[PDB]
Design a protein around this ligand. Structure first.
Ligand SMILES: *[C@@H]1O[C@H](CO)[C@@H](O[C@@H]2O[C@H](CO)[C@@H](O)[C@H](O)[C@H]2NC(C)=O)[C@H](O)[C@H]1NC(C)=O
Ligand SMILES: *[C@@H]1O[C@H](CO)[C@@H](O[C@@H]2O[C@H](CO)[C@@H](O)[C@H](O)[C@H]2NC(C)=O)[C@H](O)[C@H]1NC(C)=O
Ligand SMILES: *[C@@H]1O[C@H](CO)[C@@H](O[C@@H]2O[C@H](CO)[C@@H](O)[C@H](O)[C@H]2NC(C)=O)[C@H](O)[C@H]1NC(C)=O
Ligand SMILES: *[C@@H]1O[C@H](CO)[C@@H](O[C@@H]2O[C@H](CO)[C@@H](O)[C@H](O)[C@H]2NC(C)=O)[C@H](O)[C@H]1NC(C)=O
Ligand SMILES: C[C@H](NC(=O)c1ccc2[nH]c(=O)n([C@H](C)C(C)(C)C)c2c1)c1ccc(Br)cn1
Ligand SMILES: C[C@H](NC(=O)c1ccc2[nH]c(=O)n([C@H](C)C(C)(C)C)c2c1)c1ccc(Br)cn1
Lengths: 323, 319
């Protein structure tokens, strides 16, 4: 009934013999206009999504292929948009500092002028030259194309960083305690460090049908419920699981919600994402965030301004005293 | 009883070193009842109220060589590269001459801001429209941004017929601006000050509101003042405005401060139809022709500014 479910099951047939072009088809799949009931009255983001669902062979316009010239213990992969210079620089100065080696990339798509974005291209290459932590692909960086950002990143991992022990993918408006990250990565059996995937996992969740919510998905697009999935701003996982994640992506259609898509891929691998206390997608204790020790035990809080990130990191450096 | 009113009436005595006294006025900790429980922005504002002699770190003094018809002065903060660029590309295009300045203070590292200095340098060189002074660009220091701007107008752009000062997140129909500037009797082009004037307004006493002003600090009601992200006025009135700044104590709300200067010159700000401080026809903003007659709309994102300007360019053929 729902278009995505019907297309995914068609994909399931060709990958699963016991049930007996979606990857590089980059002209509009016009059949959607006649097969999706109500196509021309959907929001534009749904139209472009359905029209170009079967295109994912996009290329890197800016790469740092040497970012992993030393087997990293932690790859920091931060989603960002072109104009977010303040968010990126505060991460660079605070928790996203490179260092058990820690390495940092920012994952960007394109904000092109035909879509009326301001031309910030020359300041980005200037930023890319100085800091050399910018990965940009040649696809339109939009809300419903974030599954592309995830698949293209996992491809980059498998091509240019397959060694990294662990990976963190997150937003550029979240504070993460990377010191307490490296400490969690070591209360870690060499067994659990194999299939690691933790975040704020949401279960039994379903698509929102309110036309005016941001995570709205109409019934002509998706039916049923969502798999378990770690949402809310960032998750942590092992590199071994990242390589397996990339190779399964070909067997799952892109979904407009990037975190739901990552859960759909994990479930296809036979995995359940592990919830964790320290993933505070909904901020910290009753507006009492001005004590630094509440940040010493968590892994990330959402959300923080650039100024806030630097100040928290600055105070965290002395928190081994005051606590 | 209110600290600002008492100090201003004291100022309303000398005119019948309140501008360069840049050490912490400790007397406010004794006279302001409840000083040490006020929010930090009030403590800082009251401590340094009599300090306003700040200097330009970045200037474009050759900006006004050619007698400009309209000076576009846009308040901005250091991290707002996208907002400024979209303005450059759209309604803030230079061109009856139009010139552009962005007005910035400092977002220094001591206050935990990211270091964006080298990119602001890179940006200033390539676009030469950044005016930066050496004061902390904070909310309650915005009256400082205005006074320092008028000082720059006096020192470096005294010729310009008219000036527009506004926020970096408003859309401004510049073509329709230059059209109000024609239905202008050469009398009105002298004392012009138009905007979304608000009368009978008063301080908000709610401690959690953003324009909250406690009783210990200000009592009474505000003068008429143009608010809401932009106003338009003549250069002749700009130079008279700067000269009177020396005779009004800075106020934590910049728009209110400009009205207090207006009233002391015996002027009432001229409310105008086209200053859409609270947007347009609830949600039917999807028609370019609602933008043909207005002067500005608050608020719009960088993408929305470029896209409206782009459609406006052919709105003479379609509305
Ligand atoms: C992804 O793969 C498709 C298919 O290989 C590419 O589409 C080609 O586009 C060129 C450009 O005009 C056409 O001449 C070819 O006919 C297309 N390919 C085929 C096999 O028909 C596409 O360019 C690739 N990359 C992207 C970013 O879409
Ligand atoms: C996801 O990104 C792709 C690539 O940037 C978008 O596809 C382009 O869409 C435009 C129309 O907006 C077409 O004219 C181009 O031919 C498409 N390019 C390719 C390579 O397919 C797509 O629209 C984006 N999807 C969403 C939902 O934003
Ligand atoms: C405003 O002007 C006063 C007076 O010129 C400045 O005060 C001087 O500051 C320097 C630098 O710290 C001192 O060495 C002098 O002794 C000060 N003189 C007096 C009379 O106090 C003040 O610094 C200026 N403010 C700003 C922001 O530039
Ligand atoms: C307005 O800007 C001035 C200048 O940046 C601020 O004054 C400084 O405040 C710091 C912190 O208290 C002092 O250490 C400096 O000595 C002050 N400098 C001068 C020249 O006075 C002032 O705090 C700002 N006001 C507000 C309300 O933010
Ligand atoms: C205006 C808003 N845009 C996004 O949400 C968006 C778009 C592209 C992005 N590329 C990317 O990396 N991110 C990350 C999440 C962050 C952390 C960098 C922000 C992106 C977010 C929106 C769009 C549609 C709807 Br409906 C409702 N709101
Ligand atoms: C976080 C927020 N900051 C501001 O509102 C602010 C500060 C300095 C500014 N310098 C300047 O030009 N602007 C223009 C208006 C714009 C158009 C650039 C935004 C400034 C705004 C805030 C909210 C509530 C409280 Br209480 C205190 N602060």
């Amino acid at each position: 009934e729902a278009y995505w479910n019907r297309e995914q099951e068609k994909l399931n047939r060709q990958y699963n013999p016991i049930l007996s072009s979606h990857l590089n088809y980059c002209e509009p799949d016009l059949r959607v206009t006649s097969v999706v009931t109500g196509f021309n009255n959907l929001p534009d983001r749904f139209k472009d999504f359905l029209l170009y669902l079967r295109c994912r062979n996009y290329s890197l316009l800016i790469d740092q292929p040497d970012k992993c010239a030393k087997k990293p213990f932690l790859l920091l992969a931060i989603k960002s948009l072109t104009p977010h210079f303040a968010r990126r620089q505060a991460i660079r100065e605070s928790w996203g500092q490179e260092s058990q080696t820690v390495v940092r990339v920012f994952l960007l798509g394109q904000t092109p002028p035909e879509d009326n974005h301001p031309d910030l291209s020359d300041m980005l290459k200037f930023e890319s030259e100085k800091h050399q932590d910018i990965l940009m692909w040649n696809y339109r960086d939009t809300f419903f194309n974030l599954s592309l950002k995830e698949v293209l990143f996992l491809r980059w991992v498998s091509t240019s960083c397959p060694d990294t022990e662990f990976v963190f993918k997150g937003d550029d408006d979240v504070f993460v305690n990377t010191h307490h990250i490296l400490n969690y990565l070591n209360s870690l059996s060499k067994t659990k460090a194999k299939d690691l995937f933790i975040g704020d996992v949401i279960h039994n969740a379903g698509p929102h049908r309110d036309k005016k919510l941001k995570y709205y998905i109409p019934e002509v697009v998706y039916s049923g419920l969502y798999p378990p999935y770690a949402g809310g701003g960032g998750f942590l996982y092992s590199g071994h699981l990242a390589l397996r994640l990339y190779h399964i992506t070909d067997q799952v259609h892109l979904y407009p919600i990037d975190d739901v898509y990552t859960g759909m891929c994990l479930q296809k691998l036979g995995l359940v994402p592990e919830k964790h206390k320290g993933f505070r997608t909904f901020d910290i204790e009753e507006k009492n965030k001005n004590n630094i020790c509440s940040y010493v035990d968590l892994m990330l809080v959402h959300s923080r301004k650039p100024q806030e990130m630097i100040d928290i990191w600055s105070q965290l450096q002395s928190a081994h005293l005051k606590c």
